Write a protein that binds this DNA or RNA. Structure first.
Length: 1072
RNA sequence: AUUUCUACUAUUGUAGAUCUUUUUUU
């Protein structure tokens, strides 16, 4: 089952030596130099923790309010596929982030309504709106979490004695950084103008004023406030990029000044310096007045103008993502201007203004000569078209004068214009009947108006089969309806034929596009040469202590690469490894450098960073992590385990008030080495080939079919077992191993730890003794643990007591394991939710008079049966239960939206136990799989039901916020499990990722076929069921939950594991 | 006590887990 694909890992190592007692001194051969380098790097690591917790809370509260406002506004607009339009560069970014093949788009501004093309059964616009919908749901989750944290934090600051409620500042930092990434992922595209609203000038205030206000917002303040907090967090516990080191000396000697002249040429093609010099120094309002004071037609028809000025005189078109910032820097620095005063000017080109909003705002300062030709033309044309059938607020004289100037004749008196007005009015009336969400009851009035409008249309020119469209539209009031309606739309939109202006904009836009694509390409190739900022080599002293000697790649001066490699000889005590590769193309070359050479290099200004790990630097240096094993296997020199030449070294600053012993009290650098597992046994599937396969659907279908054919042939004839993993009401998960005939197999021996103190304190150890024997594992509290004799055993962590205050060796263990009481409280929460579903009234009655916590517990004991442990109602989570019942109260107040209530009934309370319990479960499943010599099948639930049917919009990649199952009885039985959909889907995906890359002994095995990781659960929906309703995926067998139910095992919730394993046994036998 | 996560012990720590361009049009 050897892996034929190239795999990658990112091995991360520390780089700040922990000078402490109770930590073995390491890297002490060159320790002196290490110290110097550290105090060099602190000189660059800037920090000012001066922001008191009060001011941090002030900034956080303001940011939360702004983010909530923006999020509420955006929640109503992401799905407007008819108004949104993304630029080409951002469209490609979408097609990478969301996963769809971009196709070939003819236009620069790709309106989402024009992405009618299909891709694997869904429109291309549905992929984008689904990606935005998922982003919004995650924003909601993190806003809720961050609001709770901020509330507890400021409550703690209020009552100075109540410091116990201060949230863990680690989680505070991490939650805000995740929330800021989510928010910025949409605020940035709106801020710089990639997500645009091109129909903004035709729109009317009233029913669509919210969209206009959202199109005209200023996201400078919100973005700057998020930036303020991100800096504040990066100054007290936040990771902040330090360098990107390369280990190849041919990637470090490139000159980045090759492209310079070229870029300047393109800049002189845009006459940008003149524009920026003319505009810099003005405020945004002054720039607006300058642009609104230009002569529009004269500048547009003036061919000697820069294409930017002419475009802004025709249309609001922003400068792209990818050039703007680098262009501001590249314009400022040669000329000595302020960088920000130029970025402001480049932000001021393409700022949307709506003529209608301006006119409603003030009726005296209005004038149509302010706006570009297209915007003013659209406003005048559609307002004049609407004025023939409704009374509107704008005075027709200026619009008529504008159109008369454009065409040279009275536009409102042409038959073509009246025909356009009639078609538009018919479209407006048809829109009401085609919005089935809010159907009225006065259909007769609309139909009478529609008939009269069709009757009174006087066709200005001979148009063919128009009456066919008329009769179809009348007949419907269904596919023929849409066809005729769209053909009427084509005829209506073609009535403006003005064609001279658009013909000129053809050439203007072609030049504006070619020049900016040349700039973008030159910048992209320039910023992959200035990305690397150091050249480093790994160094081993005599005790296998590895340091990284990194020298600055000064672009302002000759670099030191030649002075590092002129000290590497063949006879010296320190070994040096440096990588040489080109993309059988890799070499890890070793030389030696003496101590005087390192001394001179470091005094010259280079950096020396220890590479620290718990196993690399322990007193016996036995490797027990996988990262340490891979570290010591990379430097064996082989080619099947490769080191990627460049890696990013970062750092995080200390948190105030933490002890220096803790890793959060120390300025901690981090190296991020990158390793490739590339086979040599034949033609390995290159990563590009993997990507191409992942894009193709049929390649995947053939691949999965052939892989499970390999498995079935290589395993069916041999003696194998079936490992069925199932959820549980009381047990988080449950594992049963059946024989291929169906008999229950396995007698697992569960152990128990105990720390025995030795007379010499340095040799204390945990002594494992057998405590239980079981044949159905309770995967909640187990963990696979290595005895000091070398054996691997399964221990039950709930059987051992822990200590109240840690680091009290003299005291005796009293408390209960924290994960155990977390699962206790999780079962209580599940009980509460199942009680809400059936007795929402008996749940809401719990808070009749704001009961005190003792009274709240007394009332809870009425509804929810106790856990059944030693102590009844021991660790009841009164706080979380109270803030879930109050949330249900708030939902049922504002109406009784069933979906909004299921957002609470199915909250998946196990989401903080996820990362910790799934690791244990993966460890145990790996242990049992490798116990039976990899000749075993895995048998898992198929969560596909929770993603609705084929009709539903959920393709699988994005988790539903609420389960979309059709049954109510089954959806109720799946809402009582400890592991929600998110938790159990996370476990399943982690297990598949684990099976894809099993490392048995210095080798990599594979049992699931080319599972594309970034696509969460489509890989399982897309599979083909056998005729027994089980989806085979390599070793794994995804079994539908509902169709696994039979006579109970002769031999409560372990029979579930037995029944999944038994159904897989039966299906596998019936296969052959 | 940690590259980091989780549960710990006080064992100079332990156990599992860990990545080219292309406008106006529905």
């Amino acid at each position: 089952f050897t892996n034929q694909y190239q795999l990658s890992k990112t091995l991360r190592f520390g780089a700040t030596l922990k000078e402490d007692e109770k930590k073995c001194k390491s890297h002490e051969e060159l320790k002196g130099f290490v110290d110097i380098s550290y105090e060099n790097m602190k000189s660059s690591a800037t920090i000012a923790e001066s922001l008191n917790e009060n001011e941090l809370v002030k900034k956080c509260e303001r940011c939360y309010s702004e983010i909530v406002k923006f999020h509420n506004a955006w929640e109503k607009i992401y799905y407007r596929t008819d108004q949104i339009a993304v630029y080409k560069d951002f469209y490609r970014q979408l097609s990478r982030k969301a996963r769809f093949d971009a196709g070939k788009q003819n236009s620069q501004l790709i309106t989402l309504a024009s992405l009618c093309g299909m891709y694997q059964g869904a429109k291309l616009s549905r992929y984008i709106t689904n990606y935005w919908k998922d982003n919004i749901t995650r924003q909601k989750s993190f806003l809720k979490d961050f609001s709770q944290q901020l509330h507890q934090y400021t409550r703690a600051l209020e009552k100075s004695d109540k410091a116990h409620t201060k949230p863990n500042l680690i989680n505070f930092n991490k939650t805000f950084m995740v929330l800021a990434n989510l928010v910025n992922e949409i605020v940035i595209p709106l801020s710089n103008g990639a997500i645009s609203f091109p129909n903004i000038s035709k729109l009317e205030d009233g029913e669509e004023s919210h969209l206009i206000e959202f199109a005209l917002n200023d996201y400078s303040q919100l973005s700057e406030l998020i930036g303020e907090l991100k800096d504040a967090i990066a100054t007290n516990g936040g990771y902040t990029p330090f360098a990107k080191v390369t280990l190849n000396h041919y990637t470090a000697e490139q000159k980045p000044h090759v492209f310079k002249n070229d870029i300047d040429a393109k800049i002189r093609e845009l006459k940008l310096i003149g524009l920026v010099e003319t505009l810099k120094g003005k405020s945004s309002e002054q720039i607006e007045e300058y642009f609104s004071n230009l002569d529009k037609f004269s500048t547009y028809n003036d061919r000697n103008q820069s294409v930017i000025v002419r475009t802004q005189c025709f249309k609001y078109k922003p400068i792209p993502f990818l050039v703007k910032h680098q262009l501001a820097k590249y314009i400022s620095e040669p000329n000595g201007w302020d960088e920000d005063a130029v970025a402001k000017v480049l932000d001021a080109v393409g700022a949307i203004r709506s003529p209608a909003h301006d006119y409603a705002n003030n009726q005296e300062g209005f004038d149509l000569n302010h706006y570009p030709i297209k915007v003013a033309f659209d406003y005048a044309w559609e307002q004049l078209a609407n004025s023939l059938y409704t009374t509107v607020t704008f005075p027709q004289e200026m619009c008529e004068k504008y159109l008369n100037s454009i065409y040279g004749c009275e536009v409102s008196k042409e038959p073509v214009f009246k025909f356009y007005a009639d078609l538009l009015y018919i479209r407006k009336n048809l829109a009401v009947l085609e919005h089935k969400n809010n159907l009225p009851s006065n259909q007769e009035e609309f139909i009478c108006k529609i008939n009269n409008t069709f009757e009174n249309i006087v066709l200005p020119y001979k148009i063919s089969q128009f009456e066919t469209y008329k009769k179809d539209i009348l007949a419907w009031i269904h596919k023929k309806y849409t066809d005729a309606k769209q053909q009427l739309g084509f005829i209506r939109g073609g009535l403006k034929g003005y064609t001279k202006l658009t013909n000129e904009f053809k050439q203007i836009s072609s030049t504006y596009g070619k020049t900016f694509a040349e700039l973008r390409d030159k910048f992209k190739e320039k910023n992959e040469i200035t990305k690397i900022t150091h050249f480093g080599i790994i160094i081993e002293d005599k005790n296998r202590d590895r340091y990284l000697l990194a020298s600055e790649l000064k672009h302002e001066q000759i670099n030191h690469v030649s002075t590092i490699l002129n000290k590497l000889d063949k006879s010296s005590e320190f070994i040096t490894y440096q990588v040489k590769s080109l993309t059988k193309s890799y070499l890890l070359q070793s030389d030696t450098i003496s101590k005087q050479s390192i001394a001179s290099l470091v005094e010259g200004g280079c950096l020396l960073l220890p590479i620290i790990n718990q196993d690399i630097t322990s007193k016996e240096r036995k490797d027990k992590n996988q990262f340490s094993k891979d570290w010591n296997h990379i430097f064996e020199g082989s080619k099947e385990f490769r080191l990627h030449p460049e890696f990013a070294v970062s750092y995080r600053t200390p948190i105030e008030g933490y002890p220096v012993q803790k890793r959060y009290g120390r300025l901690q650098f981090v190296c991020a080495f990158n390793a490739h597992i590339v086979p040599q046994n034949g033609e390995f599937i290159n990563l590009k080939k993997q990507i191409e396969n992942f894009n193709d659907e049929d390649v995947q279908k053939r691949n999965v079919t052939e892989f499970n054919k390999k498995v079935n042939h290589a395993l069916s004839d041999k003696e194998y077992v079936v490992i069925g993993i199932d959820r549980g009401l009381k047990q988080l998960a449950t594992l049963c191993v059946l024989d291929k005939r169906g008999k229950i197999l396995g007698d697992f021996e569960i152990y128990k730890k105990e720390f025995v103190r030795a007379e010499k304190r340095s040799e204390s150890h945990w002594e494992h003794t057998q405590a239980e024997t079981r044949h159905i594992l309770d995967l909640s509290n187990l963990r696979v643990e290595t005895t000091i004799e070398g054996k691997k055993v399964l221990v039950d962590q709930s059987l051992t007591l822990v200590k109240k205050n840690r680091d009290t060796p003299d005291e005796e263990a009293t408390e209960e394991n924290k994960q155990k009481i977390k699962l206790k409280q999780l079962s209580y929460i599940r009980k509460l939710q199942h009680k809400m579903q059936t007795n929402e009234q008996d749940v809401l009655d719990l808070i009749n008079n704001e009961p005190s916590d003792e009274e709240f517990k007394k009332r809870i004991e009425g509804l929810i049966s106790s856990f059944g442990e030693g102590q009844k109602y021991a660790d009841l989570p009164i706080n979380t239960m109270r803030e879930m019942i109050s949330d249900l109260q708030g939902v049922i107040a504002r109406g009784n939206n069933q979906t909004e209530k299921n957002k609470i009934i199915e909250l998946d309370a196990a989401d903080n136990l996820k990362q910790g319990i799934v690791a244990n479960m993966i460890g145990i499943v790996n242990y049992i799989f490798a116990k039976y010599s990899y000749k075993a099948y895995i048998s898992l639930e198929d969560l596909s039901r929770a993603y609705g049917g084929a009709k539903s919009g959920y393709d699988g990649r994005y988790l539903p916020s609420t389960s979309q199952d059709e049954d109510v009885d089954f959806k109720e039985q799946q809402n009582q499990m400890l592991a929600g959909l998110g938790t159990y889907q996370f476990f399943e995906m982690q297990l598949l990722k684990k099976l894809q890359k099993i490392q048995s002994d210095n080798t990599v095995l594979r049992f699931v076929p080319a599972f594309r990781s970034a696509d969460n659960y489509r890989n399982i929906l897309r599979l083909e069921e056998t005729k027994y309703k089980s989806k085979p995926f390599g070793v794994v067998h995804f079994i539908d939950p509902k169709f696994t139910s039979k006579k109970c095992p002769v031999c409560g919730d372990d029979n579930g594991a037995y029944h999944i394993a038994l159904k897989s046994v039966e299906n596998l036998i019936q296969m052959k």
